[PDB]
Amino acid sequence: IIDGAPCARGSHPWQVALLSGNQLHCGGVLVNERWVLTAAHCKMNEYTVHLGSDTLGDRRAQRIKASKSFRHPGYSTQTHVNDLMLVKLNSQARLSSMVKKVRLPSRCEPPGTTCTVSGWGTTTSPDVTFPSDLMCVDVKLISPQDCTKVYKDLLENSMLCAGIPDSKKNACNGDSGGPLVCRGTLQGLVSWGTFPCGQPNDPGVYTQVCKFTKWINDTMKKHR
């Protein structure tokens, strides 16, 4: 997260990180006691999942292994269309004050909407700086018509764009797969943008979650 600030404590209880060892690989969100949603480009053979603390490495955090994960079948490695994946926890998260399910959307929030994206990703770019503390930053949804001016053929109608005009405020390496939430609901998963991070007027791009709820529900149901 570039040009952001520490998340207020205990207010991102649905945020997780996917770790490789004790090293951050991706962000993600808790859908339920069994499942984490995150980006497809985070796929690994095995994951260690951190839940229930704004601070990485916290004594109080839960660490659960996840040995199985399920990418959206329409995911493209070449173009990153359909960049989402469900991650099955090897055991059920203990829900608590610091561990809640995210509110999945029932609606696509429109352009102009104010959102918060959260993550333990680099706070600088290209020179990297990693925070223990979960960082948050507010951006507005940006219309396909506006975002296509910048990115053209790269965009799908299931990708959602967000930023602030003339603003470095954005996500970055480590934030991948993590929550963009707007008006209480999960509206995006951090997918891609430009390098280095935080170039003014290059919006961050997100998997638009409101277009994949059927898949998310069917897949959890199918893999009960």
Ligand SMILES: COc1ccc(Cl)cc1C[C@@H]1CN/C(=N\N(C)C)CN(CC(=O)Nc2cccc(C(=O)O)c2)C1=O
């Ligand atoms: C330049 O990066 C941007 C730009 C805009 C957004 Cl919204 C988000 C990012 C973060 C990227 C997103 N996408 C990426 N690949 N795409 C093309 C599928 C790369 N990525 C994964 C990544 O770099 N993870 C990572 C994890 C841990 C350590 C490091 C490291 O560089 O040290 C990197 C993103 O997170």
Ligand SMILES: [Cl-]
């Ligand atoms: Cl898969």
